[PDB]
Design a protein around this ligand. Structure first.
Ligand SMILES: CC(C)S(=O)(=O)NC[C@H](C)c1ccc(-c2ccc([C@@H](C)CNS(=O)(=O)C(C)C)cc2)cc1
Ligand SMILES: C=C(C)[C@H]1CN[C@H](C(=O)O)[C@H]1CC(=O)O
Ligand SMILES: C=C(C)[C@H]1CN[C@H](C(=O)O)[C@H]1CC(=O)O
Ligand SMILES: C=C(C)[C@H]1CN[C@H](C(=O)O)[C@H]1CC(=O)O
Ligand SMILES: C=C(C)[C@H]1CN[C@H](C(=O)O)[C@H]1CC(=O)O
Lengths: 257, 32, 85, 85, 51, 51, 51, 51, 51
């Protein structure tokens, strides 16, 4: 922006977010790409079943006790046996019913809960810390935001210690990976999708976008390049060049794509 | 998941099991 | 320390005008920049709205190159609108 | 029509003062009432805050019976503070 | 399914009109303020009868 | 758009899609709404449960 | 657990499948940006659909 | 599953829940301190409720 | 079901039980409004507690 205003560059082509503060100093061409502030977290581990998950519902004590009870019933029968068979039947009945019920509770609980839906959920919990970049359009959005949820989030982020802000995107993503899912990274949908399609593919985007905005090509106010560039972006848009380009760089060569 | 380990609650049914087996031993004894 | 929106308005127009005076002939182009500077210097109840919005719009729509003085003299008395929204 | 926080202030002080004048000698009691009437007549960006809050406070703490004129003359220039919340 | 293409609506003004830049900046302000979002939610979803 | 070019109206506010052909004659504010061409069908009354 | 979940998902045929079947007819408005998009479209699927 | 739904909690939690659903209508007195509270309230939930 | 939902049991001994048992000792601050409240209270239970 500085290079454009002070005339050190004739044009600016980059993932530059369109903002009113920037639209005041520079001129933005119609948006060539769509994005929005989104949440990135670490994808939960699919399965770590073991053989121990079958012995999870019924306690180790219950298995030992049912074994000793079993051999106890056997040695009782070795030494009338009608009430023995009956009592053992009642016993194993209550036990299999208990196992079925407890396992049902396990699976039901496991299927019932979801970690995160939207941003509002992030605002409502102190368990998972979350943050943005040290600078840029997102931080400024949170700062300048009069909307309830975002206001609360901003208050939290600025007040929170240690600092939730990171210098680079790679640092933030790395922090998401190292934090075991205790850290959420707020970044524009584009970058989120791109990192999500790249190995190790341990990261994912949750919920919709907080806001809807776009990037754009910037030209100095009153420059001759503005209208040609704008009409050019329109041409590329209708021709589908932008779409094919995004698919080229983002999805198509995506390893996990 | 909230791991249960419900052994305390089932312990009672284990107790009525032991009681039943005890009465069983009693009947087995009075029989012979 | 209280801001007092009226003083904020007088200061706003004053800083906008004083800023636009530095750009001769480009006056109509830099209206938003100087308005940004004026909102910075005079402070704002709402960072988006700025110190005085109605004056900003008035200047943007009225001001033509080299027409600065008369345009500002016309626009400085205008209602600022809602300063919080 | 468009709202002007400055015009709102000037109108606010004027209407409060003009209101308190009928209540002369009981003036210190009716400050808030006249402030309500003035808030109604001159309008407000926030219904709770009123047209000018700082002036209201200044008057409330300063005004003594029959001391109205000097009190208003002292308080009318006072900063209104943020008329948002 | 998804969308075939990605485009947008807009407020149209005659070329070289004085209203153009004020209108544009206005749309940006309303956009960041979420006025557009809240309005869309107003007319589309809020009174939406299908849940 | 015609009313705009020929000066029968000062401004046009409507779900007017931004197109190059339109962008050549008039000026578009930054998009106040995002959309795209999509497919609308009849929702199935039931879903076959299956074996 | 399954019965306690009560989750119901509704599949979609999206855009690509629509070009591949003659069973379900489909159409657009008599004019406008959508029709013009299909008309001037150089993309395979959309071309087929327009034809 | 049925009995799990039976003992299941969260039928109603807060005021916010009334703001989040249009199925159940709700209201206050024609006048008095409550209506005025909702009227003059600048905090989100109550504002929405008032609207 | 009841294993899925679990539960919460909330015990209450309230104030009077403190008056009715010597097993659990209880006290207030060395000074302040609470101590003065217990001191000047003409109500039976609180009187006994103060004693
Ligand atoms: C900065 C804001 C004022 S805003 O972003 O313009 N408006 C907010 C509003 C929700 C919105 C936000 C984004 C978009 C949007 C729509 C499409 C695109 C890309 C994919 C295509 N570019 S284009 O401008 O539509 C084309 C036709 C050239 C990029 C952004 C449309 C509307
Ligand atoms: C990647 C960076 C630092 C840039 C890209 N777009 C935003 C911008 O244009 O400022 C910044 C990120 C953000 O603030 O979400
Ligand atoms: C509703 C109509 C006729 C308009 C609205 N937008 C499109 C446009 O701006 O052309 C048209 C629809 C379409 O082309 O399918
Ligand atoms: C019962 C009535 C009409 C009164 C009582 N308190 C409130 C008041 O003092 O205004 C009113 C109730 C309400 O506004 O919900
Ligand atoms: C902390 C103290 C001693 C103060 C605080 N509030 C009460 C007060 O304002 O007196 C006292 C507490 C109490 O009376 O139990």
């Amino acid at each position: 922006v500085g290079e454009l205003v002070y005339g050190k560059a004739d044009i600016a082509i980059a993932p530059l977010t369109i903002t009113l503060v920037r639209e005041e100093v520079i001129d933005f061409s119609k948006p060539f790409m769509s994005l929005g502030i989104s949440i990135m977290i670490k994808k939960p581990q699919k399965s770590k079943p073991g053989v121990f998950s079958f012995l999870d519902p019924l306690a180790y004590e219950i298995w030992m006790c049912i074994v000793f009870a079993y051999i106890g019933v056997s040695v009782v029968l070795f030494l009338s046996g009608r009430i023995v068979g009956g009592v053992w039947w009642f016993f194993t009945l209550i036990i299999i019913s208990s196992y079925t019920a407890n396992l049902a509770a396990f699976l039901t609980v496991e299927r019932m809960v979801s970690p995160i839906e939207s941003a509002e959920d992030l605002s409502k919990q102190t368990e998972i810390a979350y943050g943005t970049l040290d600078s840029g359009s997102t931080k400024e959005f949170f700062r300048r935001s009069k909307i309830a949820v975002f206001d609360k989030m901003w208050t939290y982020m600025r007040s929170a210690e240690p600092s939730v802000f990171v210098r680079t995107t790679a640092e933030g993503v790395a922090r998401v990976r190292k934090s075991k899912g205790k850290y959420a990274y707020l970044l524009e949908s584009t970058m989120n999708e791109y990192i999500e399609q790249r190995k190790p593919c341990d990261t994912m985007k949750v919920g919709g976008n907080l806001d809807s905005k776009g990037y754009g090509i910037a030209t100095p106010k009153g420059s001759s390049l503005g209208t040609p560039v704008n009409l050019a972006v329109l041409k590329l848009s209708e021709q589908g060049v932008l779409d094919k380009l995004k698919n080229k760089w983002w999805y198509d060569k995506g390893e996990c794509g | 998941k909230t791991s249960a380990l419900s052994l305390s609650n089932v312990a009672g049914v284990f107790y009525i099991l032991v009681g039943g087996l005890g009465l069983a031993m009693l009947v087995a004894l009075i029989e012979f | 320390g209280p801001a007092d929106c009226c003083r904020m308005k007088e200061c706003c127009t004053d800083r906008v005008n004083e800023c636009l005076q530095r750009y001769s002939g480009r006056e109509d182009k830099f209206v938003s920049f100087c308005y940004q500077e004026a909102t910075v210097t005079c402070g704002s109840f709402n960072e988006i709205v700025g110190c005085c919005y109605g004056y900003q719009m008035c200047m943007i729509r009225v001001v033509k190159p080299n027409s600065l003085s008369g345009a500002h003299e016309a626009c400085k008395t205008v209602s600022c609108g809602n300063p919080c929204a």
